[PDB]
Design an enzyme around this catalytic site. Structure first.
Site, PDB file in Angstrom:
ATOM      1  N   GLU A 154       0.833  -1.196   0.000  1.00 47.28           N
ATOM      2  CA  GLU A 154       0.000   0.000   0.000  1.00 47.28           C
ATOM      3  C   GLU A 154       0.871   1.252   0.000  1.00 47.28           C
ATOM      4  O   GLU A 154       0.519   2.263  -0.605  1.00 47.28           O
ATOM      5  CB  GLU A 154      -0.942   0.007   1.206  1.00 47.28           C
ATOM      6  CG  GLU A 154      -2.396  -0.303   0.872  1.00 47.28           C
ATOM      7  CD  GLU A 154      -2.604  -1.727   0.391  1.00 47.28           C
ATOM      8  OE1 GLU A 154      -1.758  -2.594   0.694  1.00 47.28           O
ATOM      9  OE2 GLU A 154      -3.620  -1.981  -0.290  1.00 47.28           O
ATOM     10  N   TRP A 199       4.565  13.736 -11.927  1.00 47.36           N
ATOM     11  CA  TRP A 199       5.065  13.575 -13.288  1.00 47.36           C
ATOM     12  C   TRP A 199       4.136  14.230 -14.306  1.00 47.36           C
ATOM     13  O   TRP A 199       4.577  14.677 -15.365  1.00 47.36           O
ATOM     14  CB  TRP A 199       5.247  12.091 -13.618  1.00 47.36           C
ATOM     15  CG  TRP A 199       5.759  11.840 -15.001  1.00 47.36           C
ATOM     16  CD1 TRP A 199       7.059  11.882 -15.415  1.00 47.36           C
ATOM     17  CD2 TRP A 199       4.980  11.505 -16.156  1.00 47.36           C
ATOM     18  NE1 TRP A 199       7.137  11.594 -16.756  1.00 47.36           N
ATOM     19  CE2 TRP A 199       5.876  11.359 -17.235  1.00 47.36           C
ATOM     20  CE3 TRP A 199       3.615  11.314 -16.384  1.00 47.36           C
ATOM     21  CZ2 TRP A 199       5.449  11.032 -18.521  1.00 47.36           C
ATOM     22  CZ3 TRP A 199       3.193  10.990 -17.660  1.00 47.36           C
ATOM     23  CH2 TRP A 199       4.107  10.852 -18.712  1.00 47.36           C
ATOM     24  N   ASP A 204       1.808  17.023 -15.999  1.00 50.56           N
ATOM     25  CA  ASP A 204       1.799  18.477 -16.094  1.00 50.56           C
ATOM     26  C   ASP A 204       0.419  19.024 -15.740  1.00 50.56           C
ATOM     27  O   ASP A 204      -0.375  19.352 -16.621  1.00 50.56           O
ATOM     28  CB  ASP A 204       2.203  18.926 -17.500  1.00 50.56           C
ATOM     29  CG  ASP A 204       2.273  20.436 -17.634  1.00 50.56           C
ATOM     30  OD1 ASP A 204       2.564  21.112 -16.625  1.00 50.56           O
ATOM     31  OD2 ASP A 204       2.037  20.947 -18.749  1.00 50.56           O
ATOM     32  N   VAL A 205       0.141  19.113 -14.444  1.00 47.61           N
ATOM     33  CA  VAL A 205      -1.153  19.589 -13.969  1.00 47.61           C
ATOM     34  C   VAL A 205      -0.996  20.771 -13.017  1.00 47.61           C
ATOM     35  O   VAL A 205       0.095  21.028 -12.506  1.00 47.61           O
ATOM     36  CB  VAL A 205      -1.937  18.470 -13.257  1.00 47.61           C
ATOM     37  CG1 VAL A 205      -2.298  17.366 -14.240  1.00 47.61           C
ATOM     38  CG2 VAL A 205      -1.131  17.914 -12.093  1.00 47.61           C
ATOM     39  N   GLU A 233      -8.676   2.941   5.267  1.00 46.72           N
ATOM     40  CA  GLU A 233      -8.069   1.624   5.445  1.00 46.72           C
ATOM     41  C   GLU A 233      -7.469   1.456   6.838  1.00 46.72           C
ATOM     42  O   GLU A 233      -7.534   0.375   7.423  1.00 46.72           O
ATOM     43  CB  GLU A 233      -7.003   1.364   4.378  1.00 46.72           C
ATOM     44  CG  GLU A 233      -7.559   1.002   3.011  1.00 46.72           C
ATOM     45  CD  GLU A 233      -6.471   0.659   2.010  1.00 46.72           C
ATOM     46  OE1 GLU A 233      -5.292   0.968   2.284  1.00 46.72           O
ATOM     47  OE2 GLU A 233      -6.793   0.076   0.954  1.00 46.72           O
ATOM     48  N   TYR A 254     -16.993 -16.638  16.916  1.00 44.01           N
ATOM     49  CA  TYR A 254     -17.749 -15.923  15.893  1.00 44.01           C
ATOM     50  C   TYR A 254     -19.030 -15.308  16.450  1.00 44.01           C
ATOM     51  O   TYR A 254     -19.694 -15.896  17.304  1.00 44.01           O
ATOM     52  CB  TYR A 254     -18.076 -16.849  14.718  1.00 44.01           C
ATOM     53  CG  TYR A 254     -18.999 -16.233  13.690  1.00 44.01           C
ATOM     54  CD1 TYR A 254     -18.524 -15.316  12.763  1.00 44.01           C
ATOM     55  CD2 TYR A 254     -20.345 -16.572  13.647  1.00 44.01           C
ATOM     56  CE1 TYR A 254     -19.364 -14.750  11.821  1.00 44.01           C
ATOM     57  CE2 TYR A 254     -21.193 -16.011  12.710  1.00 44.01           C
ATOM     58  CZ  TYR A 254     -20.698 -15.102  11.800  1.00 44.01           C
ATOM     59  OH  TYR A 254     -21.538 -14.541  10.866  1.00 44.01           O
ATOM     60  N   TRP A 301      -9.752  10.372 -10.165  1.00 47.94           N
ATOM     61  CA  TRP A 301      -8.649  10.267 -11.116  1.00 47.94           C
ATOM     62  C   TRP A 301      -9.141  10.223 -12.559  1.00 47.94           C
ATOM     63  O   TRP A 301      -8.577  10.880 -13.431  1.00 47.94           O
ATOM     64  CB  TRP A 301      -7.793   9.035 -10.813  1.00 47.94           C
ATOM     65  CG  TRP A 301      -6.756   9.268  -9.756  1.00 47.94           C
ATOM     66  CD1 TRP A 301      -6.972   9.446  -8.420  1.00 47.94           C
ATOM     67  CD2 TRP A 301      -5.337   9.337  -9.945  1.00 47.94           C
ATOM     68  NE1 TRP A 301      -5.776   9.628  -7.768  1.00 47.94           N
ATOM     69  CE2 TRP A 301      -4.758   9.564  -8.681  1.00 47.94           C
ATOM     70  CE3 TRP A 301      -4.502   9.230 -11.062  1.00 47.94           C
ATOM     71  CZ2 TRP A 301      -3.381   9.687  -8.503  1.00 47.94           C
ATOM     72  CZ3 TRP A 301      -3.136   9.352 -10.882  1.00 47.94           C
ATOM     73  CH2 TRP A 301      -2.589   9.579  -9.613  1.00 47.94           C
ATOM     74  N   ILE A 331     -12.034  11.357 -13.890  1.00 51.32           N
ATOM     75  CA  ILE A 331     -12.601  12.638 -14.302  1.00 51.32           C
ATOM     76  C   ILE A 331     -11.521  13.674 -14.609  1.00 51.32           C
ATOM     77  O   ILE A 331     -11.568  14.345 -15.642  1.00 51.32           O
ATOM     78  CB  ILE A 331     -13.569  13.196 -13.236  1.00 51.32           C
ATOM     79  CG1 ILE A 331     -14.842  12.349 -13.178  1.00 51.32           C
ATOM     80  CG2 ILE A 331     -13.924  14.644 -13.532  1.00 51.32           C
ATOM     81  CD1 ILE A 331     -15.844  12.825 -12.151  1.00 51.32           C
ATOM     82  N   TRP A 343      -9.339  12.683 -17.728  1.00 52.01           N
ATOM     83  CA  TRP A 343     -10.119  12.880 -18.944  1.00 52.01           C
ATOM     84  C   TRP A 343     -10.183  14.359 -19.300  1.00 52.01           C
ATOM     85  O   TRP A 343     -10.278  14.726 -20.471  1.00 52.01           O
ATOM     86  CB  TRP A 343     -11.536  12.327 -18.777  1.00 52.01           C
ATOM     87  CG  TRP A 343     -11.607  10.832 -18.780  1.00 52.01           C
ATOM     88  CD1 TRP A 343     -10.641   9.965 -19.196  1.00 52.01           C
ATOM     89  CD2 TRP A 343     -12.705  10.026 -18.335  1.00 52.01           C
ATOM     90  NE1 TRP A 343     -11.069   8.669 -19.044  1.00 52.01           N
ATOM     91  CE2 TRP A 343     -12.334   8.679 -18.516  1.00 52.01           C
ATOM     92  CE3 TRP A 343     -13.966  10.313 -17.804  1.00 52.01           C
ATOM     93  CZ2 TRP A 343     -13.178   7.621 -18.184  1.00 52.01           C
ATOM     94  CZ3 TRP A 343     -14.803   9.262 -17.476  1.00 52.01           C
ATOM     95  CH2 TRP A 343     -14.406   7.933 -17.667  1.00 52.01           C
TER      96      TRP A 343
END
Ligand SMILES: CCCCCCC/C=C\CCCCCC(=O)OC[C@@H](O)CO
Ligand SMILES: CCCCCCC/C=C\CCCCCC(=O)OC[C@@H](O)CO
Ligand SMILES: CCCCCCC/C=C\CCCCCC(=O)OC[C@@H](O)CO
Lengths: 93, 99, 118
Positions: free
Chosen positions: A6, A19, A21-22, A41, A58, A84, A86, A89
């Protein structure tokens, strides 16, 4: 073992996001989404830790708590995927 | 599992589900659509975690303890904050689109 | 009827929890202050809608994880035993989620304000 994988996963996500370009906003959204999954988690693992401490055998409510916690993780993963998808794209739009 | 067949989870489930569908059809930018989704998704996540807490508490015993009631109250508090965060999120973003 | 009484009852439990958490710990009170200041600042800050939400969403998440981790501790302390491995493990995982939520919020505010130069 599992926590390492993880850790590898979330590190790759940071590398990829760095990495790409945003802008600042979209980069935050990409990271924070995966960060949320880590948080859920960890909290879910805390639930299972308590459950395994309480019950020796149980029980219905024990399995219920684990299923609800695992469900929250699933919803978190889905939320990260949608985020990710949306944004990527849009960037390559 | 057997959690899905409950009146409480059906109502909370559809409230979030509808918002996602609506947000998916709204004419807004990507980052806006993401926030509209992530906000209501977060509410569902907290509600599931809160439901897990209560399940663990009831697993312990039927006899009441002060920490038992405290655990449920703190869990409900987190759900409240999550809903407030969701409302504020949709309020700020849609105020531009609505005009 | 049932839908309305659940909202009121949950509001009663939530306020009772927010009150108890505020009474018990000083660090929680100061944390709530830090959050409230961040909400006000972001509201008065001259930024667009998306940044304003992100600044808010960050600190709001911090409080949520804080309350949820505090809920974990309440259950752990509820259990009666001298010492257990899963006792410390549960709190360790919960505290981890708290520190992650805080750091992620600080970095978010850092990146956003540095990109805004304000
Ligand atoms: C093709 C499947 C990839 C994996 C699942 C990804 C699911 C992503 C989005 C689900 C639909 C919700 C948002 C879609 C939408 O309305 O517009 C997205 C578009 O405007 C982004 O630029
Ligand atoms: C936009 C702000 C959303 C909420 C941010 C987080 C706030 C967390 C805690 C605020 C205080 C909780 C309730 C305590 C309170 O107001 O009164 C306590 C008082 O009756 C006794 O000390
Ligand atoms: C700039 C802050 C504006 C308000 C944002 C939300 C603040 C949340 C809580 C602060 C108000 C609660 C303080 C305690 C209070 O007024 O209640 C008294 C108590 O007796 C009610 O049961």
């Amino acid at each position: 073992a599992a926590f390492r994988q993880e850790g590898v996963a979330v590190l790759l996500c940071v590398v990829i996001a760095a990495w790409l370009d945003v802008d600042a906003v979209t980069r935050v959204l990409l990271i924070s989404s995966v960060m949320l999954v880590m948080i859920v988690e960890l909290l879910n693992s805390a639930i299972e830790a308590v459950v395994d401490r309480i019950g020796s055998e149980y029980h219905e409510l024990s399995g219920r708590a684990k299923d609800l916690g695992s469900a929250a993780v699933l919803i978190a993963i889905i939320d990260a995927v949608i985020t990710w998808a949306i944004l990527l794209w849009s960037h390559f739009g």
